[PDB]
Amino acid sequence: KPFLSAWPSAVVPRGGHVTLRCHYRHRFNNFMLYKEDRIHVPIFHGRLFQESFNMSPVTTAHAGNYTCRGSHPHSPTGWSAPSNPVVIMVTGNHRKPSLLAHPGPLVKSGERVILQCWSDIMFEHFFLHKEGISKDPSRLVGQIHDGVSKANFSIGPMMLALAGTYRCYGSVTHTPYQLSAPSDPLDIVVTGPYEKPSLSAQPGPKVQAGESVTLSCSSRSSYDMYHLSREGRRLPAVRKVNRTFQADFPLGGTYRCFGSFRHSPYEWSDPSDPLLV
Amino acid sequence: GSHSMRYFYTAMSRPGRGEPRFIAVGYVDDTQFVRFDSDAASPRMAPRAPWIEQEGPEYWDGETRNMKASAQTYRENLRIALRYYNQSEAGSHIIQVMYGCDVGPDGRLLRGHDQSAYDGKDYIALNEDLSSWTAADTAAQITQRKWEAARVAEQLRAYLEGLCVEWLRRYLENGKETLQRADPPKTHVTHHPISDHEATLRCWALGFYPAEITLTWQRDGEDQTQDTELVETRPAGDRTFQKWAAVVVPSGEEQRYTCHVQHEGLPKPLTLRWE
């Protein structure tokens, strides 16, 4: 059976673009498409795709459940078995839901987090989606309660593969493949197991109206970059003479700092000890 | 002794042609005993040698969980590699990992190994001291400072000193009759005319275990080292091996040539002559 795939994403906004490729017998060459129920009834009146089916711009008509068949001459029908199903979901059709993390977006490695997706509109289904090429969204039924519909996605045990940016979408009853606009993005970050840095202040944590205060984040580990976080910033690290890597944040509130390496924005070290300014 | 246990991981991206694939195989010496393929319906660590098949449910459950985690980890590692080398998400890339332990006659640890490669080239390796790393380029250097921060080498050292050696010992015990009893080669020499002045003498060794073996051709006691056709050792298919060594000889001097065979399944080294 052929392998059907959507590039770059199966979850696609209106006005966007998505390409369907059908790989069969080491060729993307000659295939026909089908929707979810007219299973043996090819779409576009049985149009043959001599090329990967590029949809651009994407409309809600494109949304649906696709299968493909490859041209196989000298064969029971002249066509292969059905391919893997690929669902094209078109977003941007309703008001966006809200998404929040419990207890928070910073998640210790090996631990669990609940991503809650809720809405004013009575959505029948919710989809959790991680920003990335070739990714599948997770579906949950919407619980209706007190005039709002909601769904609790459980993510864990937390590893780097689950870190990243998440959006949730809603869908109503009669258009399952037509999703709402994306929720405001949520950056889920895994902390650890990289060793925690030390946090200090210059000249100190006690500051009054007039003068400067700079937080120094230091570690023997070669962190490329330090993040400063207050309860409720980003700077490159510099290697000091005593072989420590350090960053200096020129500024109250309680602060912690997190080390991190290059090309890896969603994985931070264990948090430093708290330092209140 | 001596013996070794190795694990081989292969992780492959292949946009348009399939989902990322993770394959793992386990070897004791030259014998494969386990495998994992993430392209199955419900992927499970599976036996490949009969002497591991009577291991219980607990073993296959543990190993399958471990392997699923490894598959996820190495998929994400393909993504990370893409960012490291600034490559497009349309290309096909491969991560390979081999790790494991060597033990001696008494089962004590002799050596630890953990090497990783990206697109066929050495990426990062655990040093002999099992407490440091060696990186081949800047991306690998990023990985190194990550692993040093995470103290990976110590956990690895822990695995290699304990679990790896103990399970290797248990395996060497499970299949002693096939792993620790060397199968000697069945040997014979064949003659194949080339010209009417030249002829090929071919020394054959068949059905031997383990794979390591020495086949030499001597012309009056001297090793025809750099004029010998030595084909790569190959599997018979029944967990034994085959090898041959050809030498081209002037016709009429077949007598002056002898084939010397050494293998641990042989009490004394063999010398063969064509007749």
């Binding site: - | 694990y7 793992a24 386990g26 590699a81 990550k146 995470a150």
Partner: peptide, 9 residues
């Protein structure tokens, strides 16, 4: 037995 040690790049 295979390694339980995560090797995240």
């Amino acid at each position: 037995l295979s390694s339980p040690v995560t090797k995240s790049f």
